[PDB]
Design a protein around this nucleic acid. Sequence first.
DNA 1: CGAAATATCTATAGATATTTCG
DNA 2: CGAAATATCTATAGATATTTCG
Lengths: 68, 76
Amino acid sequence: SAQDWHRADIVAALHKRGITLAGLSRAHGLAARTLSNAMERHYPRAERLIAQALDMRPEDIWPQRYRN
Amino acid sequence: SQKKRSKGSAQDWHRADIVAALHKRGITLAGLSRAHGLAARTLSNAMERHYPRAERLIAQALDMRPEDIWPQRYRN
DNA sequence: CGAAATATCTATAGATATTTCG
DNA sequence: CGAAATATCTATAGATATTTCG
């Protein structure tokens, strides 16, 4: 539980709920690709929106990005 | 064998160490970007995410291989 | 099947804060 | 001093390759 989730695991968890990164981005008024940017770099707002969709805290998906 | 473990556990340079090493050579990320026809901020993007070309240009400026600055990004 | 989403490598920029330089 | 460079959080997009979905 100290390791960041793999990007494939985050995507799989969203898809199981009937949610896509693209759809979730569009639903929040962002460009389709914007939330997927959080898969490759630290982006607090995008992380918060993704975590919210999974009923999780962003620090539990990406503990290494929230060390401090 | 001993060589292979050491590759496997190598860690990425801290961004401050990369910047310090460039500056000691009289090079800035901004200057280096502009010198290659890129926007001033573009090479600094490699400090926050995997960007192979930017990594290559930065490593070249330090006389290094990008996989020695960012071993964790070049782990296959 | 084709459409859409994801993965990757490509390159970008506005606002704000801080540090370093000329 | 103001300019320039770096750091962070904000959000973006063209193209190719691959995977997943309806």
